[PDB]
Ligand binder design. Sequence first.
Ligand SMILES: CCCCCCCCCCCCCCCCCC(=O)OC[C@H](CO[C@@H]1O[C@H](CO[C@H]2O[C@H](CO)[C@H](O)[C@H](O)[C@H]2O)[C@H](O)[C@H](O)[C@H]1O)OC(=O)CCCCCCCCCCCCCCCCC
Ligand code: CLA
Ligand code: CLA
Ligand code: CLA
Ligand code: CLA
Ligand code: CLA
Ligand SMILES: CC1=CCCC(C)(C)[C@H]1/C=C/C(C)=C/C=C/C(C)=C/C=C/C=C(C)/C=C/C=C(C)/C=C/C1=C(C)CCCC1(C)C
Ligand SMILES: CC1=CCCC(C)(C)[C@H]1/C=C/C(C)=C/C=C/C(C)=C/C=C/C=C(C)/C=C/C=C(C)/C=C/C1=C(C)CCCC1(C)C
Ligand SMILES: CC1=CCCC(C)(C)[C@H]1/C=C/C(C)=C/C=C/C(C)=C/C=C/C=C(C)/C=C/C=C(C)/C=C/C1=C(C)CCCC1(C)C
Ligand SMILES: CC1=C(C/C=C(\C)CCC[C@H](C)CCC[C@H](C)CCCC(C)C)C(=O)c2ccccc2C1=O
Ligand code: SF4
Lengths: 31, 92, 107, 183, 202, 733, 32
Amino acid sequence: SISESQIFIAIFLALINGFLALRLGSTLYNS
Amino acid sequence: ELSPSLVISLSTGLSLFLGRFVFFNFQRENVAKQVPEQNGLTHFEAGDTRAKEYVSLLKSNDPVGFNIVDVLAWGSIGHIVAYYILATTSNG
Amino acid sequence: WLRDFLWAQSSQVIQSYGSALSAYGLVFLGAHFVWAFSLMFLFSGRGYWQELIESILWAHNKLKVAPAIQPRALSITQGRAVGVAHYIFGGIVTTWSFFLARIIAVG
Amino acid sequence: PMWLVGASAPDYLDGSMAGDYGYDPLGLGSDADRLAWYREAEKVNGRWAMNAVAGIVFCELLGIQTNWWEVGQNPDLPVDLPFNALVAIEAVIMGFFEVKRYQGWKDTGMSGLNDSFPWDPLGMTSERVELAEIKNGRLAMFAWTGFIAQAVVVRKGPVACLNAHLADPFGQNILTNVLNIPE
Amino acid sequence: RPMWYPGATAPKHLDGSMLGDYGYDPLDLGANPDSLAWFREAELMNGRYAMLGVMGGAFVNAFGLPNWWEAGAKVDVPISLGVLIALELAIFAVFEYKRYEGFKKTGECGVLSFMPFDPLNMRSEENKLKELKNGRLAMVASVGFISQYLVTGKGPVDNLKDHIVDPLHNNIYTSSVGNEVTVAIVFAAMWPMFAEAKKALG
Amino acid sequence: ATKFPKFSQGLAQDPTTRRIWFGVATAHDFESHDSITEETLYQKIFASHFGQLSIIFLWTSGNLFHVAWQGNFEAWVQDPLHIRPIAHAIWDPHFGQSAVEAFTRGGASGPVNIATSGVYQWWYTIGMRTNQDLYQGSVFLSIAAGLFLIAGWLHLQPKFQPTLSWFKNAESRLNHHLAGLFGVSSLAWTGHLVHVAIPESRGIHVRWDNFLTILPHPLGLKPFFTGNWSAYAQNPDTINHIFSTNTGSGDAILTFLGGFHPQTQSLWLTDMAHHHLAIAVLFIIAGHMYRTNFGIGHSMKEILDMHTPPSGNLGAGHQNLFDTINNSLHFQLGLALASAGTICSMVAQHMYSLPAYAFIASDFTTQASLYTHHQYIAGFMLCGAFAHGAIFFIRDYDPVANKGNVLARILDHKEAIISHLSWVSLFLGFHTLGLYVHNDVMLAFGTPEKQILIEPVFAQWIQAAQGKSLYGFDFLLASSTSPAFNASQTVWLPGWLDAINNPTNSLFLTIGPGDFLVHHAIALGLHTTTLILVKGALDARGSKLMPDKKDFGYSFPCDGPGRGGTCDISAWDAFYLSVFWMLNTIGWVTFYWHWKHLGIWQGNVNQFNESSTYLMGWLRDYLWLNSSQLINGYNPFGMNSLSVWAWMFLFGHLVYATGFMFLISWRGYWQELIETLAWAHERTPLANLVRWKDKPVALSIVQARLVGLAHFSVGYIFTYAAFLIASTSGKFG
Amino acid sequence: MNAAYLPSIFVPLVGLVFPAIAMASAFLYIEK
Ligand SMILES: CCCCCCCCCCCCCCCCCC(=O)OC[C@H](CO[C@@H]1O[C@H](CO[C@H]2O[C@H](CO)[C@H](O)[C@H](O)[C@H]2O)[C@H](O)[C@H](O)[C@H]1O)OC(=O)CCCCCCCCCCCCCCCCC
Ligand code: CLA
Ligand code: CLA
Ligand code: CLA
Ligand code: CLA
Ligand code: CLA
Ligand SMILES: CC1=CCCC(C)(C)[C@H]1/C=C/C(C)=C/C=C/C(C)=C/C=C/C=C(C)/C=C/C=C(C)/C=C/C1=C(C)CCCC1(C)C
Ligand SMILES: CC1=CCCC(C)(C)[C@H]1/C=C/C(C)=C/C=C/C(C)=C/C=C/C=C(C)/C=C/C=C(C)/C=C/C1=C(C)CCCC1(C)C
Ligand SMILES: CC1=CCCC(C)(C)[C@H]1/C=C/C(C)=C/C=C/C(C)=C/C=C/C=C(C)/C=C/C=C(C)/C=C/C1=C(C)CCCC1(C)C
Ligand SMILES: CC1=C(C/C=C(\C)CCC[C@H](C)CCC[C@H](C)CCCC(C)C)C(=O)c2ccccc2C1=O
Ligand code: SF4
């Protein structure tokens, strides 16, 4: 019953949690 | 101005009594014996900023020097005896 | 092969206790124990077992019971042989017990 | 002027940082590098909230917006732009200044500003009034938290509260109407 | 150097050398592992062919109303299948074969020295940014004309008038992805700070 | 360093593929890299915790989001007993018309997985009752986790990079983690219970909208602040209270009645609200113990250093331990896994018997899938508690500063500990097996009357003290006379004596002869697992055979086939052997838990306590009946809804069986085989042109055993994970 | 559920595409 609108909001919100990891994992490996 | 507000006022005076009466003797006597350190050095000079042992807040003109945090440490125990006596009503 | 064969066919050996062929029901399991027991010798290695014996000698020494023939753990190729000895032994004795209990009942 | 009586000595702070009572119990004032940053967040939170009181007080005292927490929930705003939109409209034009006042802060000038450099159009005072900055600020922020506890417990805005206490002092106070729920 | 106001630092890859450069290279694609200015034409050809794109779908809502999405549908012209596409196949390739194979050999200025097509060349090369700049802008609206049909469905101008009639109630923020964009607007406000905190806090 | 293993130049330059394999497995070891200073070692760690901590949240937001989106919730909320909770849909491009349909079981349209995870009830017994609530909740954990990936990025820059001694300040963490992390959270959680869960338990919808417009209790905080605390406890619920509605619903908030909530057959919520609210008060008090900047408190070391007993039995006692502890990481990590490891198990011991969540112990298979999870995941953690116990002794233990300490006294007697564990593990070895075999033979020859059967007297009398009246004892709670029953008669006895005496709930299942013999196997498994691990730790330093192991590394293949052919001589190879026993002593448990319950879920106690004594019933009854449902999944007649597990149960063996190829066959055989292939590929035509950069080589000795034990476990788990789930999903208890 | 077309878009992307890219890029980084 979840509105189709909310769904893409969440997926886009979890898309940012994908970049903050990439930014972390770089800076951590770059050390 | 009745027993609920009287007892906690009458209970707290018990612990602050003992703290200054005598236990100002023994607490101060272990504090001088016990100080924290790491690698044989205290936490200030090992590089930790937040860890500087902090007396500059702790002073008084009280006759023995009884200070704010000892009011906090004993007054809290004064509030233990407080909320044990009123709150229970268990076997008298 | 699990359902129609091992599972299906093995319901002859398991239900026999108090029957004439019950000695197959014991051996059937007895061939599992010896097989699973083999894995001890195949997966392990000597130097762990020689270190452990060093401790137990401390017990016998402490009681002055130390033997004059010094216990030594099995040699490498020794432990490999006794590993195959059981893995095959315990594994063949199952099918021995699994066949006979099967057909002696059925055939 | 130490913040309690005597003691209260921080080796790190002289007090040249604007205003001082000597008050830093936990010690967050160490490693004074970032203490710069802690300085002018206090300024902002003071310089900021200080309006939000007058924002609530003014209208509630004299005007519309009585309840002030349900405002934005209520109907008939002076501008009827929707909720879903107006959020964006808020952050973007804040976004220009907030980044800009930062880049001006991170700029050689450490003080506050807006629209790049220019800050004082009148050019009043850098000292005594400048100490009235943080004194009024530290009170303003402190004054804010009250408004919260007014709405949670009493659930009546300050104007009624300030009308309620001088009406009944001994039946209306912090301790009475907390223990007495029936708002 | 307005440079899209991140704050100060742009990557070295975009210094302001190539025309139109505001120094925006989020993904490190503006680098030169093979080339960059190939992207410029790729931008430009996209840009050029894009900016002229709107004109077709734009004016048609204002005149006879076979609007672009419905335009290529209803006509009497195409003659028995392949003739409709087959004619349009050749004429592009034959000249594009020239300019594509040529100007990655005959030099990297896509039809700038203009040997295939000779303009009046009165203004010539200095303001060339402005071309690139005026099309890039039309590039972004071109996306909108899509969503103008997808979200709403009305013609671009039939959408304009609605925004003119009811300026408050015609926003995206109401309809559909409005809930989605208003979040992408918020997460775009902090966007310059995260990029700035690399430099300042590091 | 250029090439892949950037952190070590010994691997960085390797012509072979061993550069590749170790490059992955040597990554997370931060004590070994090019140059790792003490400060920058703590850095990557504390950053990594932000990684683990953020990964968890996303993982949770997934569960929430899917159930909110691909699963049914409302439909389940209405009929918790008669409908199955659904998890993510089944998308395979690979299906026939049948298997799609056969997996569409549920309320949804598509094929879906009935969710045995168990997370689905803990949402309802906290209470939500909209898919909106789940989505609303699944966004925060997505957001909140983003805060750590920010924080992770944020604390590695020079400015916000914390100093070393910030990490080594151990009196601040304890004060904070006890009061702030443990204690303050427990407050907030009773806040949630009283404000949300408990009223919503009675059918009052409270959300972040109506939250503060509705009292949790009819009184104010008047009773709380007057000091009169029995109001909240004054009006408990009715026995016939129906959950998530208002019927006879009591008004109380903080009570405990003991026992369960007979509608849900779960714990009372007011009983839990009272719980955490007490724990909140304990930790917060116990977080002020240790000294911080304010100079009032304790000093960790000068607590310890005064505990040397005034005899010398312990010699120097605890002396310079706060040195070793606060310096050695592995010592701190050995405790962490040991402490958290046991609790994982403790969770599983309580959580089946005291089913906190509503309407579990109704659907059974979500208990089984849990209890086994927390036993296995508790197993691995202890086996790691001892490994890092060995890595401690192998590296960061110092015998000089520890001279005369308590750690040095243990190393002073290695054998006593090693030898006595070797006695206890043998005693339980011969006698526990010796009885199963004796019972087998006697039942084989047809007279069970001859069996050895011992009644588990003590755990019966312990249940007698608990007050189970099925026995003839009557001490303490079992006897209404004793000065125990009289003490608690007024509070938690009346309820909690019903739960224990109503033999449906699994609280204190009745024990017996089969129960007796198993607990010794369990007891066996715990000793031989420790015996291995306690050995690897004490012999990490050295033994009589090779007393260099301190300086020879931690994990190394061997000392070579000299002086008797050392093999597995290391302390990694010692740990390596523990897993194989860990997987038994847990396997015995999870078996013995399952088939005692199966009979009880199926309504008969006689399948176990009759056939539980002799080893054939385990094979003949528990294994034979359960397998019939699982193997019919892939049946050539058609796909059952268990065909999911029918396949995996085979995938479980084939991995297990693959695992022997690595454990048994050792390297030198394969290295001569690759030689022949690297010759053939090299001199064959058309493949001359295509060659390898990294010269292929038979993977290292230790590498195989590690790969070997992975297959062994991955296979060992998937079979029992499929057998357990698909036995209780096939029958439904 | 209203989103139903998503799995057909993602699962192939995350079951094949990402394992195709992360197979290529992680390889090229093994040798430099
Ligand atoms: C969790 C996985 C993620 C999710 C799943 C993803 C799928 C997994 C795909 C596998 C990907 C990794 C494959 C690793 C294979 C290589 C293993 C190896 O050769 O690794 C072996 C390494 C080799 O040892 C290291 O070897 C090193 C080699 O020396 C190198 O290091 C030296 C130290 O500086 C110098 O640098 C020197 O130059 C250089 O040669 C050193 O000797 C180190 O001291 C020594 O530690 O051993 C080690 O350190 C041991 C470290 C491992 C300990 C953990 C073992 C636990 C066993 C698993 C438990 C069963 C789990 C089943 C789960 C089932 C449920 C699902
Ligand atoms: C958020 C606003 C804010 C901020 C950033 C600061 C920051 C600062 N204050 Mg300050 N102050 C504030 C509000 C604030 N204050 C208020 C409201 C008061 C009135 C009570 C004061 C009164 C005060 C005095 C009297 C003095 C300072 C001083 C200082 C400086 C030294 C302390 C330091 O480094 O710690 C950094 C501190 C922080 C970063 C603040 C952390 C606060 C935590 C995170 C939240 C606490 C929440 C609270 C418990 C809940 C509400 C309580 C309510 C009863 C008020 C520092 C720059 C000293 C000075 O002269 O230096 C210039 C000094 O002597 N302050
Ligand atoms: C109040 C202040 C405070 C708080 C809240 C925290 C909180 C935290 N610190 Mg921290 N820290 C503090 C002060 C504080 N710190 C100070 C002052 C210092 C300087 C000395 C540090 C130094 C420090 C370091 C150096 C590290 C941390 C770490 C952590 C995290 C530990 C992981 C965790 O949450 O475990 C989760 C566990 C719980 C929430 C509770 C577990 C309780 C037991 C195990 C089980 C109980 C739960 C229940 C029974 C099971 C049911 C659960 C339910 C879902 C069913 C955590 C976020 C570590 C970390 O993760 O890095 C970020 C870390 O490496 N801190
Ligand atoms: C929070 C817990 C924790 C932490 C922080 C560590 C941290 C560490 N451990 Mg450790 N350990 C733990 C728990 C923990 N361990 C537990 C529970 C065990 C028992 C199982 C061990 C057993 C153990 C051993 C035996 C060794 C370590 C080592 C190490 C160090 C390096 C780890 C490394 O190189 O990994 C790098 C990453 C890998 C090796 C990944 C390999 C993947 C493994 C093999 C699992 C593969 C199975 C997989 C899940 C199957 C997928 C199924 C699917 C296909 C269906 C590091 C300090 C090593 C060390 O310090 O040596 C000096 C070492 O030798 N640990
Ligand atoms: C079912 C297989 C099996 C069995 C029975 C054992 C048994 C044992 N293991 Mg073992 N192990 C196994 C598999 C097995 N393991 C596997 C797969 C591994 C992984 C590599 C290990 C790894 C391992 C380690 C690392 C250690 C052990 C230890 C032990 C001993 C623990 C004490 C005990 O229970 O004694 C019970 C003993 C028995 C039940 C033996 C039964 C034999 C009977 C009683 C006597 C012979 C019967 C009959 C007379 C023979 C007639 C033969 C004919 C020629 C006449 C014991 C000998 C520990 C140890 O040394 O303990 C001291 C130890 O350190 N094992
Ligand atoms: C770690 C938690 C986790 C796990 C195991 C899964 C598992 C699954 N999801 Mg998923 N999902 C999650 C969180 C998770 N989800 C979150 C937080 C969101 C919100 C954006 C989604 C949104 C989502 C959608 C929209 C769909 C799935 C689908 C699926 C299924 C197919 C795999 C797929 O397409 O994923 C693709 C998922 C994503 C691209 C979202 C990002 C990945 C999430 C955040 C997990 C990342 C954790 C992981 C460790 C990151 C490491 C990557 C790399 C370094 C290895 C599978 C059951 C599909 C499905 O149900 O079809 C049957 C599907 O259509 N997921
Ligand atoms: C004895 C026996 C037989 C029959 C009855 C029973 C069976 C109950 C049994 C009873 C035994 C009992 C209760 C013995 C104890 C008696 C007690 C408590 C005697 C106490 C006497 C008190 C004395 C001197 C006080 C001396 C002066 C004091 C403090 C000064 C303290 C001060 C200081 C320095 C700190 C601040 C406060 C203050 C007051 C200024
Ligand atoms: C100047 C002056 C006059 C004449 C001379 C004299 C020496 C008397 C001097 C004395 C001045 C006076 C009256 C000083 C009084 C100081 C006092 C009472 C300070 C108060 C201290 C108590 C404090 C912080 C509270 C601590 C914690 C409390 C409660 C919490 C209690 C709790 C409750 C019951 C609910 C949850 C659980 C928990 C935490 C146990
Ligand atoms: C080997 C290694 C490397 C170097 C350092 C290191 C310390 C890590 C060292 C140690 C590693 C590990 C993990 C050691 C120990 C692990 C284990 C199994 C710890 C478990 C301890 C269990 C304990 C206490 C139980 C104590 C007693 C309990 C509950 C029962 C209490 C109670 C009873 C029995 C009836 C109910 C009421 C009451 C009174 C509470
Ligand atoms: C278990 C095991 C051992 C330990 C097993 C040993 C030491 C066998 C020794 C036991 C013998 C059989 C006891 C012999 C008893 C005497 C014959 C005395 C009996 C007299 C009467 C009672 C008959 C190894 O030494 C070993 C070495 C190399 C690889 C693997 C392994 C291995 O797996
Ligand atoms: S196997 Fe490994 S350990 Fe045993 S001998 Fe050959 S080399 Fe030494």
